[PDB]
Amino acid sequence: LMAQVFFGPTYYQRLRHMVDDKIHARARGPVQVLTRQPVEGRSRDGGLR
Amino acid sequence: NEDYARPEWMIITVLPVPPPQVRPSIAMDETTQGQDDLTHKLSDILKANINVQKLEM
DNA sequence: TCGTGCCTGGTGTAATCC
DNA sequence: GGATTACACCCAAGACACCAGGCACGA
RNA sequence: GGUGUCUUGGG
Prior knowledge:
Chain A: Belongs to the RNA polymerase beta chain family. The structure is cut from a larger assembly and holds chains A and B. Chain A is largely without helices or strands. Helices cover 0% and strands 0% of the residues of chain A. Chain B is flat, with a radius of gyration of 16 Å.
C-alpha cells in the first residue's frame, strides 16, 4: 500500500442494539379493534406510521 | 340556517347513543369486560336520568 | 341471632383573543 | 385582566392498575 | 391475543 497506516490494539466494547432487536416487517395481520388500523409495536407484527 | 342549523337545537333534548363499535368493551383479563369509558359515562347519565324523573312523581 | 358474603357508590419562553 | 392554548418527529422495551361500609343469606 | 399509564432508552 503506497501509504503508511496507523495501527494498534484499542479497546472497544460491544453495545446492545443488535440487528435483531430492531429489524421487523409486516405483511398484514393483527389489527386493533377500535379502528382496524394495524397495531402498535414490534413484538406483535405491528406496522409503520 | 333553518333547514340545517336551527337556533333551538343547540340545547340537547334526546341524547343519541353510539353503537358498541365506538365503545367496544375491552376484556379486563380476557374474561372480565373492563368497560369502555363511554359505557360508564352513559351508565351514570342513565342513572341520573331516572333519578331526575322519579322526583317529579 | 351474628358474623359471613357478595356488593355498590364515592374524597381531607410566552404572545393572542376575548 | 383575565381566560385559553398552544409549545419537535419516529421507534423500542419493561413494569404495573380497588375500598369499605351496605344489606342479604345460613348452620 | 389485552388495554392504559409512567420510566429508560435509540436516531
